[PDB]
Amino acid sequence: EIQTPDQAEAFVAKVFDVLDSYDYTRFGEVLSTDLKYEGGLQKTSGLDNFINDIKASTQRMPGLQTSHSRYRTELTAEGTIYSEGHSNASLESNPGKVVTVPMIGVFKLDSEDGKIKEMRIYKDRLPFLALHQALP
Amino acid sequence: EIQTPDQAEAFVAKVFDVLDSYDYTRFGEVLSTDLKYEGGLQKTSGLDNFINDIKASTQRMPGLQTSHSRYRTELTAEGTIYSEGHSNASLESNPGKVVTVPMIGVFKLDSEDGKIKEMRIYKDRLPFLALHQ
Numbered sequence: 001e002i003q004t005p006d007q008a009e010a011f012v013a014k015v016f017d018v019l020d021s022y023d024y025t026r027f028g029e030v031l032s033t034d035l036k037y038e039g040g041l042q043k044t045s046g047l048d049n050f051i052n053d054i055k056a057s058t059q060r061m062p063g064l065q066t067s068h069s070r071y072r073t074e075l076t077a078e079g080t081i082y083s084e085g086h087s088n089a090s091l092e093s094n095p096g097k098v099v100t101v102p103m104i105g106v107f108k109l110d111s112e113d114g115k116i117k118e119m120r121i122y123k124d125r126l127p128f129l130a131l132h133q134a135l136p
Numbered sequence: 137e138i139q140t141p142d143q144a145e146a147f148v149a150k151v152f153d154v155l156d157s158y159d160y161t162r163f164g165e166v167l168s169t170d171l172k173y174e175g176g177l178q179k180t181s182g183l184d185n186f187i188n189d190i191k192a193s194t195q196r197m198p199g200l201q202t203s204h205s206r207y208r209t210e211l212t213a214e215g216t217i218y219s220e221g222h223s224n225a226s227l228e229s230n231p232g233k234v235v236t237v238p239m240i241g242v243f244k245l246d247s248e249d250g251k252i253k254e255m256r257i258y259k260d261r262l263p264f265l266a267l268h269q
Contacts, residue, residue, distance in 0.1 A: 040259070041237065074216060076210055078210065084242065101177060
């Protein structure tokens with residue numbers, strides 16, 4: 001399982017590689033079915049409701065592309081992952097305009113399979129109004 | 137110094153009682169002069185630059201009132217304070233129309249006087265556009 005901050009950061013990179021692929025069939029590899037997610041005022045319980053919300057947002061922002069990087073991750077004695085990095089988005093119809101904001105993810109893992117059971121993402125969404133006006 | 141999460145929480149509560157007063161002469165009580173601050177796209181180095189950025193931001197939302205709560209604070213072996221809570225904002229002209237968003241603070245302390253030398257605030261500022269109406 002996850003025992004060091006470098007293992008924690010590698011898992012977070014893997015998690016966002018999956019999320020940013022929008023391959024929804026692979027979300028269950030790293031996210032618990034009972035995932036408790038909070039992203040600002042967006043809040044869901046259950047992996048199905050998480051996927052629905054992402055899908056509802058991909059319909060409102062056609063051509064949306066996202067990527068993530070991280071540079072500083074701590075794994076605490078309580079098992080909490082704090083991972084600071086950046087969130088990037090652009091529209092395929094205008095690939096030159098990229099919006100980037102700092103972001104931090106707070107994660108709790110399932111004690112059996114090591115999937116994310118709690119995921120709280122903090123970032124400022126106001127800059128993304130430069131892409132599309134139908135944000136989460 | 138800071139040794140328990142309870143002490144970390146109380147310091148963060150004191151820090152935002154100073155920040156939410158907007159008494160810029162008191163900021164230097166809890167913020168180091170070399171403060172490295174990041175709040176979304178806003179990024180400042182030095183306490184004077186931080187005060188100027190907060191001044192500029194408040195000057196365009198006259199009547200702004202802010203407060204902060206917290207429910208989950210961790211103090212790590214590295215001395216990092218992660219504090220999850222909420223950020224509230226309203227206008228003095230309509231004090232019952234409040235916008236509240238979740239917010240997390242990342243803090244690092246000066247080992248000599250205990251003031252904040254690194255403060256990185258993460259929240260969504262988009263909902264606060266509702267205050268302009």
